[PDB]
Design a protein around this ligand. Structure first.
Ligand SMILES: CC(C)c1cccc(-c2cc(/C=C/C(=O)O)ccc2O)c1
Ligand SMILES: CC(C)c1cccc(-c2cc(/C=C/C(=O)O)ccc2O)c1
Lengths: 11, 208, 208, 11
């Protein structure tokens, strides 16, 4: 789930 | 351990069907930042964070727009600043669930003056949903849920000691929120099916 | 006022799709007698008693068969004494909701050893559902709900003082029960649509 | 709702 998985790692 | 002050900080930190879809999509990005600010959420395995947010986003957003709409007369204040009132809701085909939002959530939040700490704690309880399918260790999520409601109860009993039933009254809006979320999701799936959703969005990923 | 002993007394006093429908119909008659034994229910206006039981019967029955099935291995004990296990559930097309019943209700009731007083009190909370549409005075129903959970909380805190979170843990199975009930009802409407329900029954009235 | 309304009055 590429958007959510990226946003969770984005600081 | 699960301080309500941190949950409050997280709250404070963050065509009608086009408007509904654009508002939900806007708030999905914000919701991820909110969840990272809830104590210990970011310590869960990443794949479990994904599972919890996919399971809970819709109820989490509905709780937030319902509380935001306390000061609106017979309507919903979307995160974009646009209102949904009864005529728009019927044009979108969502008049019945609109009425349930107003009678089961907005008006009840208003009547009891649910505060932002209480809202944030109910949203953290919904976030830490141990029934979410595929979690690596559902009991760890239940453990975090139980820390939230222990803190919520202590907060309500300190601030509102003349209302001994207030903690249970808050928790007993969650079945309504669950029902209402299921019906809103049905509407959103239908908007996607017929091509009325903006494409290429985070909302579309949540609906896929 | 709302004594848990009376709620306990009420509990103690009372093709796979054919079996599921016959079991639900059997228990509908019993459920009316159960509701009359819950303090103050029979004092509500008759039309409100009708509304509450039409709104709540399905969740009330699901809670009861779930608790009854604690001693069954990977299955549901129907009120007729017939079991539903995984193969039958899939033949009926209800395998996914069967799995949710076992993981979200039966196993959780078993793990915490939910007792019959607690079960009866959760069922009375579901019965006294103030969101039920058309009630003559929804707040009177909320008032009775709040008497039930005040009594339930005092019972849990006396019997299980080493488990301070037990009362909230009981209430937080109600969103699962709400979801599960909605899906079971969907299945029952489908069985009626295609003509797999026994005709001329109390169940058919509930589905009409 | 004739069945339920009757059963509620049946003692
Ligand atoms: C109640 C009615 C207006 C309806 C219908 C279908 C979907 C929704 C829906 C809207 C949002 C909006 C969030 C905001 O503006 O903060 C989020 C999730 C949602 O499910 C609402
Ligand atoms: C879980 C699965 C077996 C499934 C599917 C659809 C409906 C139902 C369903 C069954 C009953 C049975 C009650 C009893 O024997 O006490 C009552 C209400 C119901 O919704 C179950």
């Amino acid at each position: 789930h590429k958007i959510l998985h990226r946003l969770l790692q984005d600081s | 351990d699960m301080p309500v002050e941190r949950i409050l900080e997280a709250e404070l930190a963050v065509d009608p069907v086009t408007n509904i879809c654009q508002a939900a999509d806007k708030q999905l990005f914000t919701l991820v930042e909110w969840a990272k600010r809830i104590p210990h959420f970011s310590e869960l395995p990443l794949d479990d964070q994904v599972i919890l947010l996919r399971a809970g986003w819709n109820e989490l957003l509905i709780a937030s727009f319902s509380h935001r709409s306390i000061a609106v007369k017979d309507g919903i204040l979307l995160a974009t600043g646009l209102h949904v009132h009864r005529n728009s809701a019927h044009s979108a085909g969502v008049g019945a669930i609109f009425d349930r939002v107003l009678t089961e959530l907005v008006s009840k939040m208003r009547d009891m003056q649910m505060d932002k700490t209480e809202l944030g704690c109910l949203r953290a309880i919904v976030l830490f949903n141990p029934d979410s399918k595929g979690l690596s260790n559902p009991a760890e999520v239940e453990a975090l849920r139980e820390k939230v409601y222990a803190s919520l109860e202590a907060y309500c009993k300190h601030k509102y000691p003349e209302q001994p039933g207030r903690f249970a009254k808050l928790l007993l809006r969650l079945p309504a929120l669950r029902s209402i979320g299921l019906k809103c999701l049905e509407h959103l799936f239908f908007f996607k099916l017929i091509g009325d959703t903006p494409i290429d969005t985070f909302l579309m990923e949540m609906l896929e």
